[PDB]
Amino acid sequence: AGMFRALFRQAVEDDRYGEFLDVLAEASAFRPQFASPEACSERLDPVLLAGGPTDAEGRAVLVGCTGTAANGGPHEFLRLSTSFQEERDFLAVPLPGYGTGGTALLPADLDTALDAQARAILRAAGDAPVVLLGHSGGALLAHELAFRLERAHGAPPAGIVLVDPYPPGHQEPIEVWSRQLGEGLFAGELEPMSDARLLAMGRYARFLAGPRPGRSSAPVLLVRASEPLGDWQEERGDWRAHWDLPHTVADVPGDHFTMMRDHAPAVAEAVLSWLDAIEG
Amino acid sequence: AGMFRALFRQAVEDDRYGEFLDVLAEASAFRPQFASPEACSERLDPVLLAGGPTEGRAVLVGCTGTAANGGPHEFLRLSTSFQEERDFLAVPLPGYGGTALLPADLDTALDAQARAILRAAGDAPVVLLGHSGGALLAHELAFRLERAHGAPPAGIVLVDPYPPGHQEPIEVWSRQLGEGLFAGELEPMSDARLLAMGRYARFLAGPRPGRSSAPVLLVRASEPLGDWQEERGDWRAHWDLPHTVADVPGDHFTMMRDHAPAVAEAVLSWLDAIE
Ligand SMILES: *P(=O)(O)CC(=O)[C@H](C)[C@@H](O)CC
Ligand SMILES: *P(=O)(O)CC(=O)[C@H](C)[C@@H](O)CC
Ligand SMILES: [Mg+2]
Incomplete structure (x- = not known):
């Protein structure tokens, strides 16, 4: 439902996902924007998706950072969150610009979006220590938010x-598998991706390609898929997700998509073990 | 209407017409295309809009321009001044017509139009006519023929052409151009036609094979479309060494909008001279 989605479908079909994302990014510049975190069109109130034990003092809460995928939304963390029930509080924070009302305004810049989220999260979490969690584009967003906070x-x-992050220095798998990634996005549709949401996705992709100097001092758990998303020539190097100097690395079953789709308990299990190790 | 129109409207507000046209061009790459003149999804049969007296007298062929808000009505006001003087045919521009396939390149579109024009005209000599982007297209078609x-x-x-190397006034006035498109709307410009417009604008910025030997009548607006400092030079439309130059009242838009009879009169006089 919309020209942009028809164009996107054709671009994937023609193996030009990367070229089309640049088009979405350029076109997104002409969407109405918010320039201050106060001027955000949506209420970014996190949703509590799982509750920890009533038992609840100085214990970290999980914050799921919604990813960039135009087919995403409030359903993103539902499978993963069930594995945190009776273990940790899990809050899912929306990403500004993906909402309806009257479509949502797009952030003028990434820091503006991060500030809007940061405020929402601090209000919701109160005094509790916060652990940010994201997958793919959301993993990249989780780190940027951590630095902003x-x-x-x-x-x-x-x-x-950081679940399956591919940061700017480790792009080759993104490029080699762009058809599978584009196909993954159509495969994951619950409804047709709207033009407004495809534009939001392009705007954030471009934000995340740009110069982001700061490195968070928070420790990092890197969670990596164990299965390749598609064919990969061995002499290219390692296809696996990467992060510079993680505190801990965990490997889980599944590929880039299925690690969260079919193997969410394994992801949750890695996170819980790691949180216990960093807390005492 | 569609998202592209909404974005375009904002781009014009932001004085970023040129940037958005480039977005439309890049996006048009992902529309279904035709790569052979025969593979054109649409019939390009010219429509007869005026009838001359009932000999080897030239017929006029209107070359439809690139404007996403244009189409069938483009030459209607002009054509009335040709009734009882000359036959006037309007040829559609491929990709504007389930939506029409876009030409893979300009030559493919030109070939489709050439074939349609040659069967409609028959023995008669043909004089091509276009306005603005359509003027650039009329010359490219003439060369391909x-x-x-x-x-x-x-x-x-050539009615107010601004060819490569001479486009500073239309670049400077791009906002007026964008505003003109929305003002000239009869229905909301579709996303498909906006994409066709970007694709053709890109064709016409590309390197072209050469110059037609056909004689040229250059028709120029007398009034500037926007602000212009005298010290900047001449803002007027340009063509290298035309056979004849005619200046008519109006600006880029109104020369056709309000002053079409003056354009027609210049054309009629010139056809007599070249015949
Ligand atoms: P992920 O969001 O599943 C895939 C990914 O990293 C894409 C290609 C980037 O656009 C996200 C910034
Ligand atoms: P005209 O079509 O009003 C403006 C013009 O001269 C065209 C769009 C060129 O700039 C592009 C071929
Ligand atoms: Mg390293």
Whole structure:
């Protein structure tokens, strides 16, 4: 439902996912924007998706950072969150610009979006230490948020969980598997991706390609898929997700998509074990 | 209407017409295309809009321009001044017509139009006519007819052309151009037609094979479309060494909007001189 989705479908069909994402990014510049975190069109109130034991003092809460995928939304963390029930509080925070009302305004810049989320999270979490968690584009967003919280809000997270991140220096698998990634996005549709949400996705992709100098002091858990998403020539190097100097690395069953789709308990299990290790 | 129109409207507000046209061009790459003149999804049969007296007298062929808000009505006001004087045919621009396939390149579109024009005109000499982007297209078609179809037209009428190397005034006035498109809307510009417009704008910025030998009538607006400092030079439309130059009242838009009879009069006088 919309020209942009028809164009996107054709671009994937023609193996030009990367070229089309640049088009979405350029076109997104002409969507109405918010320039201050106060001027955000949506209420970014996190949703509590799992509850920890009533038992509840100085214990870290999980914050799921919604990813960039235009087919995403409130359903993203439902499978993963069930594995945190009776273990940890799990809050899912929306990503600004993906909402309806009257479509949501897009952030003028990434810091503006991060500030809006940071405020929402600090209000919701109260005094509890926060561990940020994201998958793919959301993993990249989780780190950027962690740095923003530390520098602009004096509130560095207790940790960051990065599920299958592909940061700017490790792009080759993204490029070699762009058809599978584009196909994965159509495969994951519950409804047709709207043009507004495809534009939001392009705007964030471009934000995340740009110069992001700061490194969070929070410790990092790197969670990596164990199965390749598609064919990969061995002499290219390692296809696996990467992060510079993680505190801990965990490997789980599944590929880039199925690690969360079919093997969410294994992801949750890695996170819980790691949180116990960093807390005492 | 569609998202592209909404984005375009904002781009014009932001004085970023040129940037958005580039977005439309890049996006048009992902529309279904035709790569052979025969593979054109649409019938390009010219429509007869005016009838001349009932001999080897030239017929006029209107070359439809690129504007996403244009189409069938483009030459209606002009054509009335040709009734009882000359036959006037309007040829559609491929990709504007389930939506029409876009040409893979300009030559493919030109070939489709050439073939349709040659069967409609028959024995008669053809004088091509276009306005603005359509003027640039009329010349490109004239060249393709001569090169590839062994049939140079008898003349070309260029109504306010701004060819590569001479486009500073239309770049400077791009906001007025964008505003003109929305003002000239009869229905909301579709996303498909906006994409066609970007694709053709890109074709016309590309390197072209050469110059037609057909004589040119250059028709220029007398009033500037926007602000212009005298010290900047001439803002007027340009063509290298035309056979004849005619200046008419109006601006880029109104020369056709309000002053079409003056354009027609210049064309009629010139056809008499070249015949
Ligand atoms: P992920 O969000 O599943 C895949 C990914 O990293 C894409 C290609 C980037 O656009 C996200 C910033
Ligand atoms: P005209 O079509 O009003 C403006 C013009 O000269 C065209 C769009 C060129 O700039 C592009 C071929
Ligand atoms: Mg390293």
